[model samples]
Target chain A: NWSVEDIVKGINSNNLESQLQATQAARKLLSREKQPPIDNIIRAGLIPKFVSFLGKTDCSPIQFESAWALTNIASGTSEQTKAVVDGGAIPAFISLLASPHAHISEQAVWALGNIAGDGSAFRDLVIKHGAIDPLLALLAVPDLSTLACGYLRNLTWTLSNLCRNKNPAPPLDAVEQILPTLVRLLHHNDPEVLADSCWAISYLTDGPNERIEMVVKKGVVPQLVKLLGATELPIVTPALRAIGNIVTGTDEQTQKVIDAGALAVFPSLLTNPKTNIQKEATWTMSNITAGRQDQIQQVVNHGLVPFLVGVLSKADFKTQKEAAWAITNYTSGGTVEQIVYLVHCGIIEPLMNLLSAKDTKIIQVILDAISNIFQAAEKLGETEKLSIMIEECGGLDKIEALQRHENESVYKASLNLIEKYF
Target chain B: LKRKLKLKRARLAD
Candidate 1:
């Protein structure tokens, strides 16, 4: 076992070469696949040496290795993070955010974000050090390398959590301050940058009125709508999720979004040959409908349900599972008319068979959806609801179409649910 | 360019 005194001896030396060798030795000992020698190294004050490397330039790209080492060290026990913090690593990392070397700044943010995720105490130091402004400034760099955007993504992800989880939550002032810059990032040439920007926005506005208002007024919906039909699904997925998170349940905001051409491109996403796109589109659609059934009916009228129904039938079993889950959320406490409409669109059987799926979670979602439908029916009574379901709801034709598909589980489940309702 | 191997089995097989 290397004693703490030996680790200390190397840290105190100013020789860069010797320092790196000693640092690597300590890192290796601590990072072995087995138990980390966390307390043992920290007791020897190895952290101050590692922190000092954050500024040592004699070794080329020392900051990157420093960031890498800090990331791994923070990943160890909370005691390790406390030691890194106590040894003055947080201010050093914030200094790197403004470093002339962009890579150093970027890597430092990545390390800080990882460390910050471990505790709000570490996060508070980053906040006090005023790292957020410089980190957000990176969004303006014209041609960011993937590493730079990754830094922004990870940093905003932590900032999003920090600003939300803090006592009484960070003021909407901070969110509004970051809002315009982040929205501009949605138009970045890189798809992942756009995704990260939207993900950051989702976290920022997760449940706030002011952030939502500022976001919609900035014309976020129009930009996101255009991206919805972009060549890549990853590009659209996060934006659509942002749209769902922000626009849902807000009437004028939803209208502004729709009037800005939000609904027009959504149906095309359903047919996107990529299963993940289909799933994201479905989930986004579900969130939209959960807020406004009338708008959902209009979307259904635009020919989404047929594609959405096909999503369940034609999808791989996992994709089918996602489609069913989305539809369940979309139709929770299903309106008799909407349930009947979904039944008419040939969704009933696929939804019914889910009760028997091997995935316990999927089974529970299906059972919950059915219970919601039953409660709605009991409120309206059987005769009126059944009349609305079979007569106006495209009931028999859907069953006949479902019969054309050779899925036995769906067939049995749908027949049983239809029988119970009628 | 990388080859695009088909998941035709996953897609089309029952």
Candidate 2:
């Protein structure tokens, strides 16, 4: 209820003692008020003063409060973020990373991450200001046992923001430099570190095959697979994302994930209670199933096909779509025995159920899996029995109905199945 | 005439 007018007055009127007290007041008001006056302070034009206070090395407490307030400001809208940067806080914040004062050093890197979280451009801006050297220096400790989790958490969070973009991805060299730091922290006992570190690798690999190999080359895929079993959503989500991103690469990169025990992790994740986790898990499975023959067999060998078939039957449409991708990809590349086993797992029943799918893409892939089943049976010269089984399972009618499907591939594929087999 | 007789031998392969 107190006047912001005098708060500004106290800050601007500026006896050194009064200025410090007012900055502290504004600091708590920013922290205590559910909605802080980031906008109001910017309007008060005190950001430059806070920026000024941040650099004055003589006063450690003032620098801490100043850094804390700017951290809150940077966490605001893009314009507010730019306001702090434009007001020239980046150099101050970067310099504060060298502060002998513990709180000042911690708060500085934390603020830079908040700015980076606004978008990739700000991430570059933070990195361009030479933020990574001191940032990673703090985290490069040979003994993680000595570092405080709060600082470690902020350190990893900063690196996570730095690593978290793909559209016009952060410069590749920056990404490469950040990966080793991420790999080092990936095994940190702190869930916060593990989550952000995993998240950083996920974003780093979100771009291309070359980038995916960069992470795999660092040998963190094993740790990533191990994290999938972590009980915390914070850790498991990004671990899944990083794993998901890695498998999206060439079959070689995809193979590493399987070779690292990633396939064995899928059954549990595919059935995870969170739909997002389940969605990506099945989606990641689709990427692997879409890989080489041995890769497809590994998925089957791991006994994850049933879990995917389960997702196909019961998960939400988004997840079901990916499951169908996994199933159909398996059909396209899988050896005849593998495809036969997939059908025997009751995949055909649910496969037919999705024939009514509104997306023609799903419809087309569904027809693909069905045809694979027929081809498997045909190779055995079991077409006659196959026809009866499909008809009994109500699949033949669904195929017959798709003969007039709006999508040309669906229509043609469906008709070919009907004409040649039924 | 033949067709109707065949209905009685449903198991007969073509």
Candidate 3:
């Protein structure tokens, strides 16, 4: 016949047995399908009581259950999580990260994960409490339980959120040593673990070109390509994003991803049902095409031209923008035969249609690709056929309209094309 | 083209 107040009173008792019972009771109450019990627990001023038990190493089960309760509470809103953090749970919970008790470590990691996931200055607190070293060390442990896998996933997720913060990014000095471990986790068989690890890697490689180059130097590119073949959407999306960022690095780095067989996967990923992955793949290809003539020819030889045209004609504007950039790069740098391959892939009409788009950048790319293709046409003595294709697609009108474009280069290129060919 | 545009603007100025 214990009320909510009585349960909390038992949690506050100095007696260990009574406190354990109170924590188990609270865990059961919060773990129910309904939501009211959580609100009741918070209202009972039992959050600090739960956090207090986290430091008691002698009572392992009590520590585990108390962390379990706090973990669930931390899973609540920012206001609710702030209560746990303010109750001084972070340092105590961080101490449990080194607990010999696996269950205690599991629950503590979960609790900190949710706290860090709350994302309103708590991430910095988690780092300030020195959580990164222990969490990164835990990733090296072999034979993790399924529950341990979940804890590892959350650990990586917490680190990811920390790195992704705004204004000034977290100082990731710990990251250089931890990166190889994350790259190793890419081979982890667990899909969720793999997804979270990719997310961490993606965030690690996200900002500043040097950070991207750092992960590539640690051999993330080859493993990233391997994860690109993963059947899971969660896995593929972040893998693609990481590779997309990696390709924006130096030519040697971009060549590394391509050498890892990114081009082999590009054809299928370009038309993947997930539009986000499709967009990322297009961006990756855009960078690859912007490489030297040999690299551009490799992309064309791999049968990317028609697919690039398809994306330009059918994909969303964001994706189309990347596809247009790919064409522009390919045309700007591709060999004569590779440029001819683009024309044979029916690029003229799409380029004309894209020429009318209001986005100055996309219009510029379209204009440049068209100009290069026309250059190829003249070189091959096929200018007559190419001009007829442009005229039928109303490309001449678009070019004429571009004569007054705000950008001087775009205006000059348009004027040059009209005077030379129109 | 650049020179021609400059020449045309000059003629219009005159």
Candidate 4:
């Protein structure tokens, strides 16, 4: 940790290396295993210590490093977070956010994420402290750097959660103030930001799911729709997930998913070999089909089952469970033949495999899917189909495999169901 | 001294 006198010495010294070394010392002091060093850095005085580096005119490696060092020290630790906030460094951090240099800005925004803790915390300190304008400005520019985009998403997620947990949350107008500026980001060509911006808008809308419908009315969905066919799955999956999540809460949004043509992309994505993309696409499918039995055959008829089954063995527990849940929901009111088709495509075994996962939600979803399958089998007068499906899903192999995959929820559920049936 | 002054003024204008 930097001793106070050494800090002052570095601040006054003309040597950039020594200054950076001093800044680093200040940073380390915050995370000190001991209290004495932290106390010393705090007492060393604020502006002069940090201002020494912040004031550097040149973007020397030392200068930028020192600035970043200061930011790291100012992160999540209570003393540093408070000191950075109280020391009038917030404005400087905002300035850094807009700076031409990426490293400096990255460090500054990261430091803010640490201090803000959550969206509510950011809202109180950063927003209430008047840091919102610059933060928004940084996000407004097209094709933000990874660090910058991550920072914005962190900020938005934090704020969204804060507003959600509030009892008589601050007036809607206060929240709405941040929306229009963020909405303009809808036009951004970058898929990552475009998805993040959509989620951010959804977050700010607050509750009964009406706000998303209203925002979509302004034509946000159609533009987002254009991104669905994008070849880059990284961009398309999340964008689709964002659309699904926003509309999952209401009937209006279900229509928006349909209107935006979100369903058309699911079969292709579900069939895609990439694990992450499959997880998100399946998750989106579940969200899209939520509460809509009428749309089931249309979705399956789109040839989603073959693709969904193809990836079953490859999907992680969450992806498999969500895909099972989606298939279950979409098949709820379907014909017996459609249900039989699903089982024949290996849906039962894959779903049984998913229920054995460790995550309770994954297990629950898989169980629900099992229920759908069993009920459909009984209705179709094909009870034997149930046994055959379980045997193929690997009653014994799934158990040994479950032990291998940490006996995850999906695998164990497969075992529990096999024991019940056979 | 000139260099120090020049740097300060240059930064101040920014």
Candidate 5:
């Protein structure tokens, strides 16, 4: 039942009893569900004093309470978090990572997590103060307490936030240390920890090709594929994203993930009720199909063509666009038999329907698929039958109409189709 | 300029 003024007075007092009372009061205020007291503490200019306690050598209750107060404050608005960062809070917290008391270290990690989670600029400040070394050290510890295990979950979550931050650049070389840890963390039974691990892998695989290769060489693909069966959406979402990104690497890398059994999950996720799941699954398949003809045949042989056609015909616009992109890659690189299989699976009619879309990107993808179909038909000496089917299905008019498109590429592509085939 | 004007007038007359 302490007033804000009394709490501030206690905190600023020279007596240890007064200081401990004030710290407990502040922690208690923050632990409440209300808002005004939290705002009052930030307004009182005491955030830096709390940060100062973190660097204190006494290893007492005040440091832990101060860290808890700062952690709560860091969860507030950007300006509130700025008070913590501008108060020179980061290095103090980084030092506390080595504290002998587990709770003190946990509170320190929590405070830093909030700071890094605020976004890229604030996160860069935390990273600049050498947070990664301690965080990496903390993650390597095994057999932690239940609370420490929870703290480890938040610790990995913070690591993920660090990896996800982009402005002013992520700590890129840190991935060399981070990937092996994430591979180990992926085996943790906690859904939140596993999800964050997959999310970290997804972020690491998202950048340059060498980074993707780095993650692939760490043997993360099978682990990612295994998590795709996780019933938790938190786990499945990022697992799909990592798979999608890895397949965008070299043919060998794509084959690695495919060989890890990525295709087995495709049909279920393609028909998933959630549009987002559908999009990730479709993007992954598209990247896979963009690889070698043998790779394309692997997807085709696993019964992906019919479900792919189903997505193109029935899914939302973005899903359809991804499906079209995949089909375009498949036709462009797939063998004549595979191309013929796509045509028989009812790919041409939907692609022709999509050609009328005003989105030039979608129009271009549909045209590319059509061009590949024509090329394949000619190669297989089925040109006349394909021609009759195109004419009967109204595809001839669709191509002729696109000849006047405002986009030069579309116009030229359409004109090429008409001159070469019509 | 005079030649262009003359052509414009002829086109208008036509």
Candidate 6:
């Protein structure tokens, strides 16, 4: 409850020990769980002095306490975070990562983590200051507690922020060096650590096969599969995301996740009460469906075709979009027998139902999948029989309606089916 | 500004 001026003046006390006390006093105020005088301290211009203390080799406690103060400041509102950034705190924290003491190094990580947590630009800013090598260096230290093991968790958060966001994804080489450590952190007992590590893996796996293969090669597939079944949604969701990104890779990489028992989790994940998880589960399966014929059978073999067929009628648009991809890709690539199996599982009814969907992207896949089924049915000497099946389910009506659709492609897709079969 | 096209349809290779 002390005045902001009084606290700042105490820090200005030039007497080293007294100054440390004042900085610590400021931390005491800044550490309040709710509404600490974060703004008032900035009004008193305490950030620069605290930023300076971060470099003070004469006293490690003052350095830590000052880093702690800046940590809180960085964690505040956007402008307050800007205050810490403008006070030249980023490189100061990077330097402290090399401090001889464990607590000081950890506090620096906590501060940098807060700064990076502000947004993508801030995350990039810390990474720009050459934080990765030393950040990974400090992360390798096993000597800390939970809060004492504190350093590791703080590092996980910073690395997670680093790995998140698009536009400029984390530098691949930097992400590469941190890859194995992320896989190992998966084994931690704390769910937050697990989630953060999973999140980092998720982002690292977000792009090209080169990026995904970096992760899959590390043997993280089994652990990520195991986590897909975790009770915590936070943990499981990102684990699912990492799995999703992996399946987007080559058939070989997609097979890695499948061999890890990933498909076994699908029945529950597809039926998950939470729709977002259900949607992502289908999206992950869609990529698998997009792969080779063998992998398509892997999905059919798991008996997930029924769940996907249900998603077509039961889930929302986003979930349905992925569901359409899963089924369509299967039609495009599945063996004739597998296509017949899907048809037996009630695929055609929903395939026709989605024809009236609004988006061209959705309509296109549904049409192509239907055509693939027609193409497959021709091989089975049953084209007319399949046409009768389509007519029975109102599939022909939907295609004929699209015959007048505004998009030429939609009209064309519909007209071709009508001319070729009906 | 580009025209907002109202439809997208897949062309059949067949």
lDDT of each: 0.62, 0.82, 0.78, 0.57, 0.80, 0.83
Q: List TM-score (chain A only) for every prediction.
A: 0.67, 0.95, 0.85, 0.63, 0.91, 0.89
TM-score, structure 6 vs. true: 0.87
- The digit string of per-residue lDDT tens for model 3 on A296-394 reads 877877888889999998998889998988888888888788888788899888888888778888887788888899888899898888888889988
| Candidate number that wins on DockQ, 3 or 6 | 6
lDDT of 5 by residue, A262-288 (tens): 898898999988899998899888888
Q: What share of the true interface contacts does each candidate keep?
A: 0.00, 0.00, 0.00, 0.00, 0.00, 0.00
Per-residue alpha-carbon lDDT of candidate 2 for residues A138-224, written as tens digits (9 for 90 to 100): 866688868887778777788788877657788889888877878888988988788878888888888768887878999898999
Q: What's model 1's lDDT at A23?
A: 71
> Can you write out model 4's per-residue Cα lDDT over A1-422, one digit (the tens) per residue?
45678766875677777777766555555444344254455566744457456656574454455555455445435665576567666666666666777656655655555555423544465656665666666666545444355555544433333233234443455556666655665565555556556555544443445555555656667666666667766556545655655556565656666767766777767766676677767766665555454555556767777766766655766677666666766566556777788777776666666645567565556555665666777776766767665767564454445444543565566566556554
Instruction: Put the candidates in lDDT order, highest first.
Output: 6, 2, 5, 3, 1, 4
Question: Over the full model, what C-alpha lDDT does candidate 1 score relative to the true structure?
Answer: 0.62
Choose the strongest candidate by TM-score: 2
Docking class of 6: incorrect
Q: Which structure among the candidates has the greatest lDDT?
A: 6
Ranking under TM-score, best-scoring first? 2, 5, 6, 3, 1, 4
Clashing pairs in 1: none
Model 1 lDDT at residue A120: 52
Candidate 4's TM-score reads 0.62
Interface RMSD of each: 19.2, 33.4, 28.4, 23.1, 33.9, 21.5
Categorize the docking of model 5: incorrect
Task: Report residue A13 deviation for candidate 2 (angstroms).
Answer: 1.7
Candidate 2: which docking quality band? incorrect
DockQ of 3: 0.01
Better of 3 and 4 by TM-score: 3
In model 2, the Cα lDDT at residue A5 comes to: 71
